[PDB]
Amino acid sequence: AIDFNDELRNRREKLAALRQQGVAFPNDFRRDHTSDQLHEEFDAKDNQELESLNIEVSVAGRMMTRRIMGKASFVTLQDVGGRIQLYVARDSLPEGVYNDQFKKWDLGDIIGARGTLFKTQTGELSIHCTELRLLTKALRPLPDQEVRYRQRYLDLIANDKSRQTFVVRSKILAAIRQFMVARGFMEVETPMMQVIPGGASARPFITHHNALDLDMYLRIAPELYLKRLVVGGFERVFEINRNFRNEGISVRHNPEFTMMELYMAYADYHDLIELTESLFRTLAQEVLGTTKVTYGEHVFDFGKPFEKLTMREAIKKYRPETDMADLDNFDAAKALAESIGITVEKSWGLGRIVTEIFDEVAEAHLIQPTFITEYPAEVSPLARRNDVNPEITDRFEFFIGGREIGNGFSELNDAEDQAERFQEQVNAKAAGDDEAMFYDEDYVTALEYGLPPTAGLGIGIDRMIMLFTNSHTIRDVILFPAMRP
Amino acid sequence: AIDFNDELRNRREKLAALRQQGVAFPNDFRRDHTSDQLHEEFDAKDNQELESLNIEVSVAGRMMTRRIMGKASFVTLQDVGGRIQLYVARDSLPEGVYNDQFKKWDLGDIIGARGTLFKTQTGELSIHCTELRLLTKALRPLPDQEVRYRQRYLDLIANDKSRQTFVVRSKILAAIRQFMVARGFMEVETPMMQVIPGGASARPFITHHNALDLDMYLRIAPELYLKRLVVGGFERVFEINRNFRNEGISVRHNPEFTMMELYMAYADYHDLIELTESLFRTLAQEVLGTTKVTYGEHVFDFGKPFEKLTMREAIKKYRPETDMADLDNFDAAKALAESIGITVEKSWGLGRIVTEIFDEVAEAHLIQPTFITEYPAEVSPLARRNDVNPEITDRFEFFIGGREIGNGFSELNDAEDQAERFQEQVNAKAAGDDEAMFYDEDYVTALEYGLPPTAGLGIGIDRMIMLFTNSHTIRDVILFPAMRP
């Protein structure tokens, strides 16, 4: 109870003393190795080899553990690469350092050491220090379960599993880029501030540009800009960045999240299906070392094709007692939708009701990688219309672990059609749909100049990261998740 | 005048006819080569070689030019890789395609072709088409000078110099990542929505999260979060992404811009100076093929060290008649500052006035790569204090072409100091400074756990891109610059 305040007081007092000696917070010590480097290169060498090699190195990091055994101590130093042992002895360090300094430091203190590599009796790689310094005094001792999110640095200091998750996140993003670039895609940066937000259906965040006394929105999706670039000739473009949606936080939703949108001209959604499957197989193989990924109580084989069902097949499969004819009648569908708990809004049409039914009925059940095709036109204002059935579009979404991971389709490059669909979206917003799209005249204009047949795909990067790190909340894969005040 | 409307009407009529024949906008044609690929691989081969090689390829792109010479025509097809010639002959294509289709198409129309490679009499690489299709009908004919920005797709279709600039932008970003990763830096993604914006001095954009009924700000800088990660153990982190500042548009300012922030523990600003110099030399060499870069009427030698001056030396050098003692007296400095047109705000202190003087006096003159050191503490709330002179911090900024390209310093890891500086910033905001920082208690807390000595650097990526593409307005290096309504 009070022992914590004694720790705080003790640290402030030790700092006070440092301040009296000179500059309390230096910036002079330089290391030449991180723990991981030392282990990779020297773990396989026995004390004999290391003795003759007589290799001196310099490291720096947090003092995680310290066992003072008189004239000698053993310390665990933790740096960006992991942990390495330090052998701190009174007679190995400059006169007085051991007793007048080292013993006065505290766990959590950032220290720097220079010494010779050797292996302990236990066979561990250790550094027999010849120099040791206190670089940063930690004023607080080393660390609900929401603390991990409110103070992610504490979580990173304490849990190696958490660190590994974020390190893997970086590996995945770098691997996606390498994968995309390998396919001739060029990464671009489109606006995140837009006067007319679009490219998706979501409530946007609105802000105001004082200089132009202009109200603007954080983008909910870069889609409309990326397709403008395809019209401009950048036929293989992709963007991996934030998108913002003024919607509530959840185990799969963060107000700001990372999405990858990619567009390749002269391709349709089938090409995107192949790309998605190869992307996941590549990432699993590349990042995890295997195509079979364990997630919760499941195992996803990214080495086998994703399952593929039309939206209706998924509805029928997960609610077998459904009279499929009900999805063809607005009243029947509205009734069905309502019977299962969906509040049917005045603005919704049959296509929207059917999609909502699909959401309620099947989504949570798509545990194994699944592609859901034949999305109704009503809910796909930017998707190419299907040649045989105008009421649906050449669009799909894919799910893994019961969550939507991506959304892709053959793009709508029919300007007149696009204009009309934007009008419907405007009507819908007038009819109450707060997520309906804004009319984007310049976008239509761009299509009038000619957009090559194209296939676009958006993938929720955070959700994707969850599947590769066995995380069951988006909060575990975003360094600083949105937290409630 | 009316000729444009005749073009529009003609295109709509041709489309109408396509609609009558079936699906006007297909998505079926697939290419296997882009123009650049064909040129790289076959430009060096004469018609003899190509004849015997009898290589068939498929391309797709915009019909830029068409010369109908009776039973044969010559077309310039432009795709993501550039341009390639098409030899379109009546008897080389399926019956009727040439006359009933090809001749009816219009420049700007997206077409696809499949044919054998050969070289024209002029020695140009061309494709003797055997199949040719209209993929997308262009309803508008091929394209103030602000149009390039309002309809960047038109600019990209029309000007290859503009395309090359953006292609180079992508190359530069990819090269920065490769450079950073080569140095063990890990790329992270920190929030772009923050309840307490910080890390810089700027008027932020504010928005509202309905779900949490919480007012939030678009980040002006990720600095405070990146340093939290360093405390957490990610000792070499960097982020390259948007930052938003509610400030006016300029030839060097966009409300949203790309900045790279990097932090490496156990390093000081001198280490950042080396990193910056190597980064520019590497990028020039790597991306431009030479370390000497032509920019406007100048040539920057990124193969030679940047010039380095303290802020005062730059002031003295560019306003030689300045009595340097004036910078040591608030009243004298205020007078000096005002005498040169700077409106000195009530909140400003000596350090701020001196910095403003430097800005007015020297900034525009730093044409050749220059590092400006010794920034006053008052204007550097997050920078490590200098050991000898507490009134200045171990901070620098670097300029090229008379514009600030980067800002870096040894980081302030003295929690108590940081808290006090935040208080001063709060006082300043209370005294009228609309750009002063907010107090960030959690940030201070993070520092209390111990931030290793660190050196951080922020570089304006867009401004950097300008120097490598001879662009003289930021508007030329951002695909969709903020435009006035």
Ligand SMILES: NCCCC[C@H](N)C(=O)OP(=O)(O)OC[C@H]1O[C@@H](n2cnc3c(N)ncnc32)[C@H](O)[C@@H]1O
């Ligand atoms: N032209 C083809 C379509 C391209 C993508 C489309 N413009 C688009 O925006 O498509 P959406 O489906 O809107 O979103 C894409 C994916 O983003 C994830 N996602 C969406 N909201 C999210 C949130 N709040 N938190 C975390 N992740 C979230 C999902 O994986 C989604 O599939």
Ligand SMILES: NCCCC[C@H](N)C(=O)OP(=O)(O)OC[C@H]1O[C@@H](n2cnc3c(N)ncnc32)[C@H](O)[C@@H]1O
């Ligand atoms: N701890 C070390 C400091 C790290 C960087 C610091 N947090 C930072 O934010 O530092 P600033 O200096 O605020 O901005 C960095 C660079 O951004 C560019 N810039 C700033 N505003 C811009 C605008 N409106 N348009 C385009 N570019 C702009 C500049 O190159 C600047 O140097």
Ligand SMILES: [Mg+2]
């Ligand atoms: Mg959603």
Ligand SMILES: [Mg+2]
């Ligand atoms: Mg969706």
Ligand SMILES: [Mg+2]
């Ligand atoms: Mg500025």
Ligand SMILES: [Mg+2]
């Ligand atoms: Mg600055």
